[PDB]
Symmetry: D3
Subunit: 175 residues, 6 copies
């Protein structure tokens, strides 16, 4: 089942992301239920917006806000919800939402899946438009479902992304 996928072949450089929401999909927010392993409908998003990249998480990871680290994965074609993709982390989006800090990593497909991202080694290598899209998406997608709000503090590098992997992996085995 999806609950027994490994975090990565070699964390934090070489990880698996479990995809929950494909890039450019209808505005249905899916989430994998941690008891069943099944895809749950979490909500029907109320803004006319879409995730600019595939969205999911690293299994066996516990972030400070109680859930596994979440990750955005650019691909040339949208992936199936429930699929698992081998990636390498390249950067991190720092925000605050109503409960203090949130981070969302960006990870690119690993070279065994594709060579089109070989030259993206860090956060400054990502296209500027795509970074600006992601930031704009996270600042507005909950505008109409409020008591909710997000603010974007800015981009960090591959080493900050890796640190967040490692600390949340470690945090999982214990609490």
């Amino acid at each position: 089942s999806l609950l027994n996928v490994p975090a990565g072949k070699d964390l934090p450089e070489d990880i698996y992301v479990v995809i929950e929401i494909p890039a450019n999909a209808d505005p249905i927010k899916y989430e994998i239920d941690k008891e069943s392993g099944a895809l749950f409908v979490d909500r029907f998003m109320s803004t006319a917006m879409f995730y600019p990249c595939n969205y999911g998480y690293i299994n066996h990871t516990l972030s400070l806000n109680g859930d596994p680290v979440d990750v955005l994965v650019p691909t040339p074609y949208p992936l199936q919800p429930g699929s698992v993709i081998r990636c390498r982390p390249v950067g991190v989006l720092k925000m605050t939402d109503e409960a203090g800090e949130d981070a969302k990593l960006v990870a690119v497909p690993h070279s065994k899946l594709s060579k089109e991202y070989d030259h993206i080694k860090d956060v400054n290598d990502l296209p500027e438009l795509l970074k600006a899209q992601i930031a704009h998406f996270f600042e507005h997608y909950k505008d109409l479902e409020k008591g909710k709000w997000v603010k974007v503090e800015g981009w960090e590098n591959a080493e900050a992304a890796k640190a967040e992997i490692v600390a949340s992996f470690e945090r999982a085995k214990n609490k």
Copy 2:
């Protein structure tokens, strides 16, 4: 796995439907296999028709005809086969097919997923065109795969829908 999703948070008011066939899909009839939990192709439907709502079942339920209670779930966008959606029952379609009574519930997305169905509290609140579509679909979708035939006896209320949940949940733990 899909075999360990709960029937509901609070049956019969607050249930989970396991989606097998999305609204407006190609005419492939999928079914979740109760031994494996996997999506099986049940048949390629022979009429040029589509399910007017997402179609699936409540887990841990046994109806009088040997299978879990089946349910139609209107959403603003079609859902993935295998996904699980939180809903509240609002009515029931009564038919007879070659083996006596069949019921199919209608349940709407629960308010935590969407507010667009808050005002639908019972069977008379459903749009008339959608009810007429569903009835027409169930009367004709098997026209070309005969020895099969369906006749529609008519709509019942939210309390009859809830009763069918409860009796089939109870019926499951025992036989």
Copy 3:
């Protein structure tokens, strides 16, 4: 889970294929991970080509190259990745790739799912264009991802297809 689907109701005449790649899809090569049962992204294909039929495998089978027997399944509409389809084998495509012989079966939907393939009993009953498409796909889809190359030796009959099922089923229980 997908790891506990049976090879077939009655091997080798009556088998289940686990679908990994739908017909006519984006050029994402998915594969079911044999440890987890989950759909993995195997690679993003580099040619502008698509599988001309749905593609997958028979569970509980071990071919000579270390993986389960793979199968192409024509359907009137593309199937979901992860779905299971009841089929009957009708022929086999023989190739050599860099590691000696490869076979890929063709199996058609079983008559309980559809009647549109009833008249296809063997390999000469398949439309010639579809056979020529499949051969052309397998000869070129890896042209740009080389150190890889495929050559097509030609079509065999339903009895050779069945033999390959049986030998790989037997080969699985033991090694």
Copy 4:
């Protein structure tokens, strides 16, 4: 302009069909406007049905119900609305509705487009399932339209289809 497209390269054996509704599309009934040549929305279909083949008309023809002769065209992938396809007539579906008698031709793609239809020379060569679905569609797609009924009378051969096209071509000029 679509108003200037010919009736065919060689009537009645070699014709063009202007496509109004794609096979397997959403339940929106499009029509070419005669004055402007633009694609108009004639209506949203109220049954959960789709056209089993692409649908349109032959330009410069006038049937006795006072519009261009309509044709149904099977193709391996749906066509774009407003597109023009070269075809051969193979049959006619005769029916009666609440306005009187009607007739629908069936034409396959010309050999210059595709060889896949070269063995279909007449109405009994069409796959039995397609004929059954086309008939069932015409008899039920207007069922939720108050006042509108369709009764299918039977099929007629290629020769009957050719005569309708000649008759209706002549009648478009001479009047």
Copy 5:
């Protein structure tokens, strides 16, 4: 030609809208060219947003910003670009941008197309969520366009929508 389509069957109560951008489509902003009547790509949208309704214009109208009056049209399925829809105005969205004042009409499908919109007679009858999404879209779709801003001023009723159409129709001739 789309340049020859009428403004409406009976202005301002019964109009035609030429559709430029489908609801829920890829983020490509199409426009009909005035000279040629062809569909041009005006631009690729840079936010991750989609139009919440089909968008287009009324032909033979000229607003005080010097183009045809635009309309937003909700429909149950997205429409084709270049297609013409018969509609009734029910409201107007007033806004200001970096070029000055602007106004966007909202029109529903005429009763001849669909009865589903017959209870919507005016701007307060639109579903509350659709109005909120349309406003939010206009206020944010140009956020990554340097120099371009939108401020939404409020809604106005059906009567205001009719006056804009008359005013702009007259102004298209008399000039």
Copy 6:
């Protein structure tokens, strides 16, 4: 009419391309008819291949093979058939086929449409994988067409692309 669209705002640096075949579409080869300006089906492709970019032509140009100059245009989402895109030439693909020599231009979206292509000034700036896929497509898409072959000769720069457009524009008038 598409027959009246200009060759470009400022040839040869700023051109319009009329789109005939979308990137990543079904294997239907569309062409604009010269007389009518309608979209015709030229053929159903017989290989399992798709165009790796949108394909079309520049109006009011005539190449030495006696039709308009064709162009391949990469865009972030597929375009509609019949739509017109503003572009800049950056390269040419030279080949020979069974009718003789041929050439295919590559043009990216103009800066007014999208800034994403502003760093692509010439043929060596295109992503290496796209060039490889375009070449491989042209060399294999007609492989199952009896009598038809394609041999790719090499690329040429933006300057060569501009000269072809001038040459073919002049040749469209003066004749």
